[PDB]
């Protein structure tokens, strides 16, 4: 159908705003700290602390399988990185205070991306 198709061409333009968000929340993380996963070799314990593990390559992969419904879900992986990081690691750390500045920072752009989504459906 050609309903199908629509609706297809609307998850591919959310899919495409949703990478240019990506990378620009991305770049509020020049240290690479949220990049990839936590290391299960490197912290075998990780699991026993956080249950739902999120970092930035993670959600590459699934943005590109078109796997986000709508930005909630897409803030929702990003708020994971975030609180994960917040519970680990205690507060006079590197890691804790990387995501401190990676939340103040990605607010503005999730404050003009919820107007993008909102504004262009
Ligand atoms: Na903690």
């Known amino acids: 159908s050609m309903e199908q198709v629509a609706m297809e061409l609307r998850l591919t333009e959310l899919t495409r705003l949703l990478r240019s968000v990506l990378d620009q929340l991305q770049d509020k993380d020049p ?4 990049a990839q996963p936590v290391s299960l070799k490197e912290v ?3 699991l026993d602390h956080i249950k739902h593990p999120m ?3 993670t959600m590459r992969k699934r ?3 078109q796997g ?9 992986d990003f708020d994971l ?3 994960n990081c917040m519970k680990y690691n205690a507060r006079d750390t590197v890691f804790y205070r990387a995501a401190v500045r990676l939340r103040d920072q990605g607010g503005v752009v999730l404050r003009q991306a919820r ?3 909102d504004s262009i459906g």
Do not use: S
């Open 31 to 34: 240290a690479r700290i949220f």
């Open 44 to 46: 075998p314990d990780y």
């Open 55 to 57: 970092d930035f390559a």
């Open 63 to 65: 943005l590109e399988a």
């Open 68 to 76: 986000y419904k709508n930005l909630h879900e897409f803030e929702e």
């Open 81 to 83: 990185i975030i609180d």
């Open 115 to 117: 107007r993008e989504v």
